[PDB]
Design a protein around this ligand. Structure first.
Ligand SMILES: Nc1ncnc2c1ncn2[C@@H]1O[C@H](COP(=O)(O)OP(=O)(O)OC[C@H]2O[C@@H](O)[C@H](OP(=O)(O)O)[C@@H]2O)[C@@H](O)[C@H]1O
Ligand SMILES: [Cl-]
Ligand SMILES: [Cl-]
Ligand SMILES: [K+]
Ligand SMILES: [K+]
Ligand SMILES: [K+]
Ligand SMILES: [K+]
Length: 182
């Protein structure tokens, strides 16, 4: 079966619309795998069981998901209120945010903003930043973000996966450089 298709649906459940699949999340974002399974099956994923949902989490190349006995959550990316504790580690001095060239003027005015999500998402992987920008358009720009510039003004830069870090907002003055990718 197509793991990527099931993972995209699962990310939607755990980040955006759990109730549409019969799921209630705890305030830390955790879903009961059994509830996720039943909702997917009712939506036509007629073969899915716990084994497959757990497998999506374990095989995810990015570490999007976290498991503990009976439960699963998304580590980041949510548009519904959750509190996820950070993974250990310090952020590197530069992080990336992929976007579109068309967004640059308003980013240079208002900073990088969270939009519909709880946080602005940054990555230590330039390649991942490019692929994220490409979801929004073909003319991609990657912002290099000065992490100490965020931290010294009191903005926590929290590690959510091996490569993804969240921050409430990126002030325009903390954008060190723009790299073009067409
Ligand atoms: N001041 C502004 N004026 C105009 N535009 C602005 C401004 N600030 C930002 N923007 C743009 O708005 C779009 C928001 O879209 P958005 O919420 O989908 O954010 P975005 O960062 O793309 O997605 C998060 C997922 O991307 C990976 O970090 C990870 O995904 P993975 O789990 O696959 O690793 C994560 O979940 C973005 O274009 C952003 O630049
Ligand atoms: Cl456990
Ligand atoms: Cl978020
Ligand atoms: K649940
Ligand atoms: K995630
Ligand atoms: K973001
Ligand atoms: K954060």
């Amino acid at each position: 079966h197509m793991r990527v298709r099931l993972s995209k649906t699962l990310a939607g459940i755990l980040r955006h619309h759990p109730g549409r699949y019969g799921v209630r999340l705890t305030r830390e974002g955790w879903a009961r795998v059994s509830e996720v399974v039943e909702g997917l099956r009712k939506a036509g994923w007629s073969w899915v069981e716990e084994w497959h949902i757990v497998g999506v989490a374990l095989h995810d190349p990015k570490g999007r998901y976290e498991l503990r006995n009976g439960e699963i959550r998304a580590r980041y990316g949510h548009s519904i209120p959750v509190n996820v504790e950070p993974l250990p580690g310090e952020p590197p001095p530069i992080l990336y945010h992929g976007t579109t060239e068309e967004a640059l003027p308003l980013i240079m005015e208002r900073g990088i903003m969270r939009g519909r999500r709880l946080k602005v998402h940054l990555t230590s992987s330039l390649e991942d930043a490019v692929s994220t920008g490409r979801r929004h358009g073909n003319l991609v720009a990657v912002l290099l973000v000065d992490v100490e510039c965020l931290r010294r003004r009191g903005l926590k830069v929290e590690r959510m996966s091996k490569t993804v870090y969240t921050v409430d907002w990126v002030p325009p003055e903390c954008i060190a450089e723009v790299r073009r990718e067409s």
